[PDB]
From a paper:
We solved the KdHpuA structure by single wavelength anomalous dispersion (SAD) following soaking crystals in cobalt ions. Residues from 15 to 197 and 204 to 322 are visible in the electron density. Prominent features of the structure include two long extensions from the core of the protein, one formed from two longer strands of the N-terminal β-sandwich (β3 and β4) (loop-1) and the second from a loop at one end of the C-terminal β-barrel, between strands β20 and β23 (loop-5). Both loops present hydrophobic side chains at their distal end including those of Tyr-60, Phe-271 and Tyr-272. A third long loop dividing the second strand of the β-barrel (into β13 and β16) is partially disordered in the structure but also contains the hydrophobic residue Tyr-201 (loop-4). Two shorter loops on the same side of the protein comprise residues 92–100 (loop-2) and 122–127 (loop-3). The B-factors of Gln-123 to Thr-126 of KdHpuA in the unliganded structure are higher than for any other amino acid; further suggesting this is a flexible part of the molecule.
The Neisseriaceae family of Gram-negative bacteria express a bipartite receptor, HpuAB, to efficiently use haem extracted from Hb:Hp complexes as an iron source. HpuA is expressed outside the cell, anchored to the outer membrane by its acylated amino terminus. Although a direct interaction between HpuA on meningococci and Hb was not detected using flow cytometry, the lipoprotein is required for the high-affinity interaction between HpuB and Hb, for meningococcal survival on Hb as a sole iron source and for efficient dissociation of Hb2023.
Numbering used by the authors: 15 to 197, 204 to 322
The structure:
Amino acid sequence: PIPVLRAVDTTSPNIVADTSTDREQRTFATQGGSVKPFTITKPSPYIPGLMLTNQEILYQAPDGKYYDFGTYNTLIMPSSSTSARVLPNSHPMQPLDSGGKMIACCTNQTSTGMNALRLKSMQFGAWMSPSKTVSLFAGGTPAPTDTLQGVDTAGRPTGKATYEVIGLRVKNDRAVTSSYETRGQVVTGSFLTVNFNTGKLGGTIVGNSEFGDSIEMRDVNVNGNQFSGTASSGGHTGQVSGGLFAKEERFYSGTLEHPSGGEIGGTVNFGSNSPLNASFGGTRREYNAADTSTDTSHLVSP
């Protein structure tokens, strides 16, 4: 049986909120809740008297309670038994001390492959209240605007980038996910492309019998590291709100290796307490700051 997750007591002197600018987080949530940084001190399991201090992120639910990301409040991992990797489309959520439930991306495990899940600078998921209302979220370290793609060669963002993503909804006490199967060959997957020349985002989060109807981006504008606009699913219009995540990557000398915005996430909101509401997150599969396209067609290098 899945264990009940207890809240973290952040009033402990060993758990200290991190107010540094470097660790500031941003969350998109449908009905409250956010990811928040802490410095946490814990006794060593191995060395007497030794205290171990590390940076952590906790999820603060809409009720104010804090939860860690751990082993039982994540998506089911795909099987490792063949080359094939299939993400199951339905997942149990972990019950909470409050009577709510929680789930977040299974970021942590190796040889899953499945690049959308390999998030390093964000998380996405959902919290359910004891009353069965849900707040879906995507939050993380925002992509600094000064190191977005193209800024180093033009002074502003330019070109295009394509992201490999997963969508999450909550249906009937379970988390349900968009179709994803890999074998960088992808049998089924969901892709979003940002055109920084035109400031547009396009793409489709692919549905199935569990997730429900696909979510098609319709008119989404991109301003700096944030975006917003409309999407459709089954005839219903939802409001898209999201952003680009992850700092830039540098070579040892300080030279830019990859721009900021290597991850992406957000929410799609079809109405207060709508079961269609979604969060999503994923990773940058490809980018080209020099692309002069004016459309949101995907980049498709092998």
